[PDB]
Ligand binder design. Structure first.
Ligand SMILES: [Zn+2]
Ligand SMILES: [Zn+2]
Lengths: 93, 148, 83, 109, 76, 85, 99, 99, 82, 108, 94
DNA sequence: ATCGGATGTATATATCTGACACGTGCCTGGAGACTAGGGAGTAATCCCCTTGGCGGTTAAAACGCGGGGGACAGCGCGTACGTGCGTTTAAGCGGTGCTAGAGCTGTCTACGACCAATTGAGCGGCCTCGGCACCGGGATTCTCGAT
DNA sequence: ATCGAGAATCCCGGTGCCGAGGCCGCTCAATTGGTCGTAGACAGCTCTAGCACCGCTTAAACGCACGTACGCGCTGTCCCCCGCGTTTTAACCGCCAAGGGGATTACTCCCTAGTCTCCAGGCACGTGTCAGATATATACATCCGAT
């Protein structure tokens, strides 16, 4: 057989972190996988276009931040930027 | 197949009224292969020049151009040593309505005067555009020792 | 094994059911033919791209991923079938 | 940070970071990929997933169930304002539609 | 004095020359016998390109030394 | 009147017209030659050298490439020529 | 003597019931036969995965539901409760599907 | 005694005239000032290339022309000739700009 | 500083746009709705334009930023670059 | 075809094969680029450009002008079903709009 | 001097002279044609790159470009562009 | 404004079944350490173009008035669609059999990436003449009040 | 059905100006030649599931009849856009002047790709059990005719 990667265990961990009691079915799990893939592809493509637009050749954190500010609506954009910068700051030290 | 009949009419057209200073014919049984002889035009630096060339007919004619090659040696900015010819009608401006007589007379016209916009050989091209006399005498000691 | 006039399989009650889900109280008598035509056009548009996708890969069975991908290209992203 | 634990645990994230890094490398997005991009991207993905899961769990608890079915996801996405705009063109399988009837069609008083 | 050369065609042409001769003159001799112009000729001595200005004795071409030839093919 | 027998033949294949196509540059050639040219030639009329691409795109959807009246004339007036094709 | 509802309340009851459920609203075999007919019209000798047919049916049902919602909005805007083919045509024209 | 055109034959003349020419319809400086106001609302002390202002004006004019075309179509659908705000709202709702 | 400048989109300047669009008769309340929708559209485009400008550590909104924002929104514009 | 000539003329095209190849290779689309892709892509681009320009020139000649201007481009694009379908969302600067008056608004 | 900026201006002019022998073109029309060519190039290249990534391939072969052309273009432009591309590749390879 | 049927929907209880949550083997992908070089950060300079200001002139906007055409409400007709019942049709479910085609593995050969010398295609700057913009006069054609 | 006056639009001829097309100088990117590592083309084998058939329920579809309520045409009222004339406001053009920051260049350093080694995190497979669906029997909200 061939191993097929997925975001299953991580989404289950997040669900248990938020709602320790409720479960999740298989169809909802596939829907969440598709949603995560779609958002990933959108943000990565926007970051790539932004990097190419400024005659650059790398994707740093700021390109991802600008892509997030472009894509997500207002309040979601602010919360996502705050979470991302917090994670990067905690990671770098 | 269908191109064989077209070759028949082209051969007949060449037969009834052959053009001036140029004559073509098939070497063997197959009508695809042809060879032709061309004289040096009077208003040219190739006086008394006799030249031979070969013609290859693709299986899809006239929808694709035929191939030409100089089996002899000639000095010209638009012809390489091996005999390859760079003219517009051969590969870029070829149409099915054209005939072998038309391409032969176009080749003769090129031999009358060169085309400097698209030189196949750039060294003799800058030699020719530098001054006319150098091209003159180089064509001289090329045509009276190769053509004759 | 040719097929003919299978568009009649989308009967009047089925279109009535779809409109009832949509939020429609009263339906005219000429809606059904228009609905069948619209559905046929949409199916042709999606299936052409799906068949192109499954033909580029040198296969003979259309995969659900191909349909998902044709829908995504056409502008109607679909969730729940992979990707 | 400590620079001794796993990368995902080091950043405080549950989503993988090495997998995101590999996806960025092999995704043909840029010739070079920075060392801080995967962390930011994983944080954004995890936040969005957490928010949608919280709303879906709220809907499921409202409907007296212990599992999240696609209907709960559809309700959670549509009822919110930001998420609905984010997923405006997305169609959820087995999602149905929100209950709304125009006021004109209702019977008169 | 004859020289063995592995040309592009592989044919070796017998001709009496001397190492003291210049490259231009031997190229002209080849053009007389083979027709290749001096610019088109490119003699190869142990993988080294010889300039036309110099002579054969500079790279020490000896009796029947196995050399190579490549034609500077531009066009055709 | 009636067109001459010699003038009617295709200028490409030196043979009678079958399913003639009338170009917007009022040049007539038989459909096999026209199809072979559009497949392999430079998408231009061989004689006057003008593009027919927009015209071809318009006419191929409604299947109006063939000249019905000239085809009828050539088959009725010269049936044996069509038979020998 | 027999009790029959006023014309209209049954439609409202069906609307309320049908906006709560999530199943599919078209019979499986006729839709499968129709999609097979279209596919074999495009390329002959084709085979279909079951999931592909299910995905096609889901997408078509969602699109039709959205179109009917827009048509109902147009019909109510025209000071009417019934939907007519001109409502569907106008909705398609505004959406830009036919331009 | 003075010659007055009937109400209706002048608007059609304007329609015929404006659908043939291509120059910009809104005045330049008021539009530029409005754009600068919005920009300073977003970020303070910005500068604008004239090409950017021209591009913004072109995009806005094209969008407004399209919106008015759809509004007129809806108004004609509603058995009227006058365009009303509800027509604009319905066209925007169907096009998905506000839902 | 500027304030109350949406009135610059004058009544004849909207009548002309409607005339180009193919409108024969105009009601008296169209102008306010048109001003509102125009302001919303400008705000939506200019936000992305300013974000693009701010990313490049610049201070001038070039035409390229506006073109890119319009392309992102699905309203591709031809003539000013790309 | 015979080698030893510029790439753009070997296939009979006018668009630059080399420039298209460089853009495809360094444009960050795929790890490797085949040797036949640039020729096909350049042929497609040249075909489309010729299609646009022929109709634009026809409209310009119909307008008694010997110079192509964006109004002619818009008239050529919007009057063809296929091209209008292709360039649906695209806005041509200084292109105007097509003449069209609804039949209901006409005087009776 | 100013750094070199590349564009499709000269090739578009050559094509125009090939179509209409005695018709000129303004500067704004040149800009519009340049933008159109760039946009179509970006569309086709991006779709081909995706489709190559789809089947775990690594090369953008002319097959991928042909499929992208068949997908993006409408009905008749698809056939004509495919025929022209096949003609160009066939003439180039031999 | 009710009041009675009568109908459909909502609620409480047993049960049983298949999908979800968890446990285990293992192997492939991720982590750790080290090296080289180019991409990007920073400082400095130039000059392009963006902002600011004045004066004029005049095309466009603001305001007001008379009125006619269009929006909107009210009525009446009848026809098409909703609701219910009996009947015919084929969807739905289970069970079995067959093989075409998806999927995986092993060889290896030819296509594409890399690098260096080289030169001509293409870009920047100049210049000029013709195509288009503009003005002025006249011919042509819709429009409307009056017959 | 029409004739004619007032007004807008199209044609034609002459003058002028600025930008589009061609030319010249030059620099750098495409070309050509050669080498090398690996991607996919092909042959072969496995085995999954897509297709075809058969029988039995019974649920959804179909056709018909009755009635009513809503779509549509018609009329009448009134009020609000429209067309035109007059006055006020600021847009547009040409001009000058200052400097901010975009664009380019040189230098350096440190951040990431590439390679090798190693090991454990997640995937495939298997198993138990309980959450939800279904059947069955009451309780209540709601609708419609009749006072
Ligand atoms: Zn013929
Ligand atoms: Zn012709």
């Amino acid at each position: 057989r061939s191993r097929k990667e997925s975001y299953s265990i991580y989404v289950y961990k997040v669900l248990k972190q938020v709602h320790p009691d409720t479960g999740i079915s298989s169809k909802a799990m596939g829907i969440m996988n598709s949603f995560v893939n779609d958002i990933f592809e959108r943000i990565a493509g926007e970051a790539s276009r932004l990097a190419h637009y400024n005659k650059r050749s790398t994707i740093t954190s700021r390109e991802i931040q600008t892509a997030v500010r472009l894509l997500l609506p207002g309040e979601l954009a602010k919360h996502a930027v705050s979470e991302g910068t917090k994670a990067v700051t905690k990671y770098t030290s | 197949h269908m191109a064989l009949k077209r070759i028949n009419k082209e051969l007949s057209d060449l037969a009834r009224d052959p053009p001036a200073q140029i004559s073509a014919g098939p070497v063997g049984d197959d009508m695809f292969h042809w060879q032709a002889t061309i004289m040096g035009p009077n208003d040219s630096p190739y006086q008394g020049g006799v030249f031979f060339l070969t013609i290859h007919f693709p299986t899809d004619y006239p929808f694709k151009p035929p191939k030409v090659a100089f089996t002899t040696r000639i000095y010209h900015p638009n012809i390489n040593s091996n005999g390859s010819i760079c003219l517009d009608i051969l590969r870029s401006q070829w149409s099915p309505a054209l005939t072998i007589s038309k391409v032969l007379l176009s080749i003769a016209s090129l031999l009358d005067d060169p085309n400097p916009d698209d030189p196949k050989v750039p060294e003799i091209a800058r030699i020719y555009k530098t001054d006319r006399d150098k091209y003159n005498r180089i064509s001289r000691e090329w045509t009276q020792k190769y053509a004759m | 094994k040719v097929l003919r006039d299978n568009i009649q399989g989308i009967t009047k009650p089925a279109i009535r059911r779809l409109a009832r889900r949509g939020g429609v109280k009263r339906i005219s008598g000429l809606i059904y033919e228009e609905t069948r035509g619209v559905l046929k056009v949409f199916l042709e548009n999606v299936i052409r791209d799906a068949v192109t996708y499954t033909e580029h890969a040198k296969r003979k069975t259309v995969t659900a991923m191909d349909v998902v991908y044709a829908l995504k290209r056409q502008g109607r992203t679909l969730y729940g079938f992979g990707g | 940070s400590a620079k001794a634990c796993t990368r995902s645990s080091r950043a405080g994230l549950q989503f993988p970071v090495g997998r995101v890094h590999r996806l960025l490398r092999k995704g043909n997005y840029s010739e070079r990929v920075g060392a801080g991009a995967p962390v930011y991207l994983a944080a954004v993905l995890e936040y969005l997933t957490a928010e949608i899961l919280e709303l879906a769990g709220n809907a499921a608890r409202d409907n007296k169930k212990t599992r999240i079915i696609p209907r709960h996801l559809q309700l959670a996405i549509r009822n919110d304002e930001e998420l609905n705009k984010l997923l405006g063109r997305v169609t959820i399988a087995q999602g149905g539609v929100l209950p709304n009837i125009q006021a004109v069609l209702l019977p008169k008083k | 004095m004859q020289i063995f050369v592995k040309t592009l065609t592989g044919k070796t042409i017998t001709l009496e020359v001397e190492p003291s001769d210049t490259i231009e003159n031997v190229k002209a001799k080849i053009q007389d016998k083979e027709g290749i112009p001096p610019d088109q000729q490119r003699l190869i001595f142990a993988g080294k390109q010889l300039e036309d200005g110099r002579t054969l004795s500079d790279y020490n071409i000896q009796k029947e030394s196995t050399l190579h030839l490549v034609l500077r093919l531009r066009g055709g | 009147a009636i067109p001459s027998l010699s003038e009617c033949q295709c200028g490409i294949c030196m043979e009678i017209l079958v399913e003639p196509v009338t170009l917007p540059c009022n040049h007539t050639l038989c459909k096999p030659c026209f199809q072979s040219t559009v497949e392999k030639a430079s998408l231009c009329c061989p004689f006057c050298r003008r593009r027919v691409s927009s015209w071809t795109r318009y006419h191929t959807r409604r299947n109006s490439l063939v000249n019905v009246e000239l085809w009828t004339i050539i088959q009725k007036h010269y049936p044996r020529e069509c038979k020998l094709r | 003597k027999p009790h029959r509802y006023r014309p209209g309340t049954v439609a409202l009851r069906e609307i309320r019931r049908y906006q709560k459920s999530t199943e599919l609203l078209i019979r499986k075999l006729p839709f499968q036969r129709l999609v097979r007919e279209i596919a074999q019209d495009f390329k002959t000798d084709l085979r279909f995965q079951s999931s592909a047919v299910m995905a096609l049916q889901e997408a078509c049902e969602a699109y039709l539901v959205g179109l009917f919602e827009d048509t109902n909005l147009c019909a109510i805007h025209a000071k009417r409760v019934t939907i007519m083919p001109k409502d569907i045509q106008l909705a398609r024209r505004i959406r830009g599907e036919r331009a």
